[PDB]
Amino acid sequence: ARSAYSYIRDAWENPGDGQLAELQWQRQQEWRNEGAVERIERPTRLDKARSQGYKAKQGVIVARVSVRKGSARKRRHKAGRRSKRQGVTRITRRKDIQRVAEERASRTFPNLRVLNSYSVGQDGRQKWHEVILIDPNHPAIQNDDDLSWICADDQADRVFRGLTGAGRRNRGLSGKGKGSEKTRPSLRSNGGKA
Amino acid sequence: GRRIQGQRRGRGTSTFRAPSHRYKADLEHRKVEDGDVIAGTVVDIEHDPARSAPVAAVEFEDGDRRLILAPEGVGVGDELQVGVSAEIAPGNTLPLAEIPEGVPVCNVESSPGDGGKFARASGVNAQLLTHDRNVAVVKLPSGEMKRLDPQCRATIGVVAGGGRTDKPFVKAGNKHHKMKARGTKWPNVRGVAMNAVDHPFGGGGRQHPGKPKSISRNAPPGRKVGDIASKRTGRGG
C-alpha cells in the first residue's frame, strides 16, 4: 500500500494548494522572524529528507536556511570596460540559491558535513531550504553502513568544492552524453567554459 | 568627472557630520501610561546647541529629570503637565483631541507617541484649527493644512526664541560659529566657479552655467543640481 511518506510528498507537489497552503502561510510568518540558519529537530519534508539520506539518529542534523531572492548583487565597474563588461542589472551568478544556502549552513556547523538539501518554499523576497548535515566524528555515524562514507578525509568541506547533489547538478554534470563535453570531469579542467 | 559635493555629503564623513557628541538631548514628549497624573517643575533653562533656542530642564513627580522643548514664556519654578487631563496652559502637553480649537501649538507628533516632529524651530507654531472624532486639522508653519490623528500629542504655545532670524549675521565669522554647531559644510563655492570636472556648471572662459538650471526630478545624483524640478523660477508673473 501507499506509505504515509507518499502523502507528505504529494502534499508538496502543490505547496500552493490544500492544507499545505495554509501551513506555509502560517509558518513563513515565524520563519521571517528567525535567523539566517536555524537548527530544527525534525525535517519539514520527511519523505524528501529520508529519501536524500536522512535518518533519525545521533550525528544527523537538519537546519533551515533563508537567502534573499533574485539575481546577483554586483557593484558597477569603477574602471574602463567595453559595453559588454559594463552590465550590472541583469547579470546573474553561477551558483543557484540552494547552493548558497548549503554553504552558509555548513559554515554555521564547521564540524558537520553537508549531505543534501531541499526546498521548503519562498515568499516574494527570500527562499528557504533545509540542509541535512552529518557529524563525521560521532560513532553512531562512523558505524552506519549507509552514512559512514561521509567520514572519509576527502569528504571534508565537500560542499565548498561542489561535491553536493545540488553542487553536481549546478556544475552541469547530470548528462552523461551530449551537452557534458565541458562539464565532466570538472568545469576547471575544461577551461571554465561549461 | 569627479563626484560633486552633494555626493561627498552622503558618505557621512566627519566634514559633513553634525557635532552630535556635543548635542544635549532629544526633546521627545514623555510617555505616560494614562491619567495625566504626571507633573514636573521647571528646574532650569538651558541653551540647545542643535537649535540655537532655549530648552527647559524639568523634574517630574516620579523622579525623572529630562530636557523639554520649551515654548516661549516658561520659567524656573513653573509647573508643567503632560497627559490627557493636563490643564490648557502654555508649556503643557496633551493629545490634540483635548486641545481647544484655535490654539497655537508646537512640537506636534506625526504619529501618536513618536515624541514630536512638527513645529520645533525657534519662535514657530502650528495652529490647531479643526477637531473631530477621527481627524484633527492643524495648520503647520509653512501654511500647509495637515490632517492628524487626534491622538497626536502636542505642547500648547509657540516655541521659544522667536525673532532669531530678524537680525543679520553681519559678519562671515558669525555664520562661521553657527555652522560649526550643525551638520553642514560651509562656506559655499558656486558651481559656476569650479572646473568642468567638478560640477555641471563648471568650466568656460567666463562664469555661467552652460545649460538651463531647471533640472528634471528624474535626474541622477551628480546631475541633479541647480533648480530642482522648479514649477517656475524668477519673481515675475
Binding site: 559595453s83 559588454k84 559594463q86 552590465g87 | -
Partner: protein
C-alpha cells in the same frame, strides 16, 4: 517614364512570344522565422550587439525598375534586369 501594362515579348517558360502583363514587385511580408531572425535574438544582449546595433542605410537618388513580367497564357512570371528610372507609370 511611361510603360505599357501589357505587351508581346518572350516568355522563357512557354519558350515563345506571348502577351505579358507588367506589375511592380510588391514587398512580401516577413515571417520572423528565418535564421537571421534567430541569430539576432541569440546574439543580442547587454551592451552593443555588433551588426545588430547598426541601423538602415541610405538611398540612391534614383532606384531601378523592379518589375514582374507575367505570361498571359501559362500564367507564370519572370524577372529582368531593371534600369534606373525616376518614375514609372503604366499606360492602361
Amino acid at each position: 517614364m511611361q510603360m505599357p501594362r501589357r505587351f508581346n515579348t518572350y516568355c522563357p517558360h512557354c519558350n515563345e512570344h506571348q502577351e505579358h502583363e507588367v506589375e511592380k514587385v510588391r514587398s512580401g511580408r516577413q515571417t520572423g522565422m528565418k535564421w537571421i531572425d534567430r541569430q539576432r535574438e541569440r546574439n543580442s544582449g547587454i551592451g552593443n550587439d555588433g551588426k545588430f546595433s547598426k541601423v538602415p542605410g541610405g538611398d540612391k537618388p534614383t532606384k531601378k525598375t523592379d518589375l514582374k513580367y507575367r505570361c498571359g497564357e501559362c500564367g507564370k512570371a519572370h524577372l529582368r534586369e531593371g534600369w534606373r528610372a525616376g518614375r514609372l507609370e503604366f499606360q492602361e
